[PDB]
C-alpha cells in the first residue's frame, strides 16, 4: 500500500489527472515496453514511445502484427502504426489506434536524447 501523504488513492482524482494530463505527461503515460531481445540488449523494460520506432502488436485482434508507428496521438491516448489500418468499404485506409501498453517495441529510433535517456535509466547499449 501507499505510505506517503502526497499521493492520493482517489479514483476520481486519478481519472481527472489521467484525462486532463498535458502532452508531456501524456507521453510519459503512453510509455511502452520493449521486447525480450531489446531488453537483453540494453537493460530497460519500458520507454516512452516515439514516432519512428518499430512496434509489434502482441495483444488484441491484431496480435503478433509488426509495424512502425505513423503518429503518436497523445490526444487520443494511443499510437497509429502503418500497415495496421481498417478498410472503409468505399475502399479507404483509415488508421487504427493501438495502445502502447498493448504493443511491444522491437527497434529503437535512437537520437542522442534517447541515448542519454537509456544511460540515465541504466542501459548498456
Amino acid at each position: 500500500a501507499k505510505q506517503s501523504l502526497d499521493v492520493s488513492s482517489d479514483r476520481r482524482k486519478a481519472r481527472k489527472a489521467y484525462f486532463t494530463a498535458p502532452s508531456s505527461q501524456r507521453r510519459v503515460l503512453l510509455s511502452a515496453p520493449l521486447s525480450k531481445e531489446l531488453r537483453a540488449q540494453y537493460g530497460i523494460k519500458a520507454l516512452p514511445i516515439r514516432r519512428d520506432d518499430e512496434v509489434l502488436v502482441v495483444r488484441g485482434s491484431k496480435k503478433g502484427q509488426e509495424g512502425k508507428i505513423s503518429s503518436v496521438y497523445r490526444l487520443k491516448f494511443a499510437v497509429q502504426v502503418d500497415k495496421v489500418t481498417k478498410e472503409k468499404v468505399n475502399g479507404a485506409s483509415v488508421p487504427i489506434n493501438l495502445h502502447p501498453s498493448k504493443l511491444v517495441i522491437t527497434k529503437l529510433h535512437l537520437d542522442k536524447d534517447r541515448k542519454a535517456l537509456i544511460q540515465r535509466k541504466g542501459g548498456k547499449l
Partner: protein
C-alpha cells in the same frame, strides 16, 4: 446549508387554480412560475437537511472496551469459534498458535509467506486472495471498490521488519500486544479471530 433556498420564490396564493406552494416567478425561462421551497418540489431542499453536528462518535466505558477485548482474546483461544468465523484453521496443530523470535525479527515478505506456510495460515492467505471481489454498491466510486476477507492477525512484542513483511502479505494484519484492537480481534462483531502469537507476545499478554 443554502441548497434549495437560492431562489426568491413566493406563493401565488389561492384564486389561480394552482397549489399554494411557493413558485419561482419572473418570466421567459421555464423556471418561472415553478414550485420551490419544499421536499416535494424538484430543486427544493430536502426534508430535515443533514447536519454536521449529528452524533458521529459514541462514547464507551473503558471497562466495557477492555471486557470486549478480553472476551475477543478468549474467543480467539476457543477453537470452535475460529472455525465458525471461517478462518481455515482445520490444519493448525492447535490453537492458540505461538511462533518465536525468528518470526518476530523476520525481514522479507518472501520468508514471511514461507513462515506462514510453515505454521498454517497460508490457507487463510489463499482465502483472502480468492475472496477479493468487487463491491455491490456506490462504494466502488466512493473509494471502497474491492472487498475481501480478513486473514490472520500476527501479534508481536517488538518490531523488526515483521510489520513490513506481513504488511505487504495480503489479508494478514499485524498488532502489538500493547494495543490489541478489538476492531480486528473480532471483525464484524464476530468472535474467534485467527491470531498468531509470538512467545514474547504471550509473556506480554501475561
Amino acid at each position: 446549508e443554502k441548497a434549495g433556498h437560492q431562489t426568491s420564490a413566493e406563493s401565488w396564493g389561492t384564486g389561480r387554480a394552482v397549489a399554494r406552494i411557493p413558485r419561482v416567478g419572473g418570466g421567459g425561462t421555464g423556471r418561472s412560475g415553478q414550485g420551490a421551497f419544499g421536499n416535494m418540489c424538484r430543486g427544493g431542499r430536502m426534508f430535515a437537511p443533514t447536519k454536521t453536528w449529528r452524533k458521529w462518535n459514541v462514547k464507551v466505558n473503558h471497562n466495557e472496551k477492555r471486557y470486549a477485548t478480553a472476551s475477543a482474546i478468549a474467543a480467539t483461544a476457543v477453537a470452535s469459534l475460529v472455525l465458525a468465523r471461517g478462518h481455515r484453521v482445520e490444519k493448525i496443530p492447535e490453537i492458540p498458535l505461538v511462533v518465536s523470535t525468528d518470526l518476530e525479527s523476520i525481514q522479507k515478505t518472501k520468508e514471511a509467506v514461507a513462515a506462514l506456510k510453515a505454521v498454517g495460515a497460508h490457507s487463510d492467505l489463499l482465502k483472502v486472495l480468492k475472496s477479493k471481489k468487487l463491491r455491490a454498491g456506490k462504494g466502488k466510486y466512493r473509494n471502497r471498490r474491492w472487498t475481501q476477507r480478513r486473514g490472520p492477525l500476527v501479534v508481536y512484542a517488538e518490531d523488526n521488519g515483521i510489520v513490513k513483511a506481513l504488511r505487504n502479505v495480503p489479508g494478514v494484519e499485524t498488532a502489538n500486544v500493547a494495543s490489541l484492537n478489538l476492531l480486528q480481534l473480532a471483525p464484524g462483531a464476530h468472535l474467534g479471530r485467527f491470531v498468531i502469537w509470538t512467545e514474547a507476545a504471550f509473556t506480554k499478554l501475561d
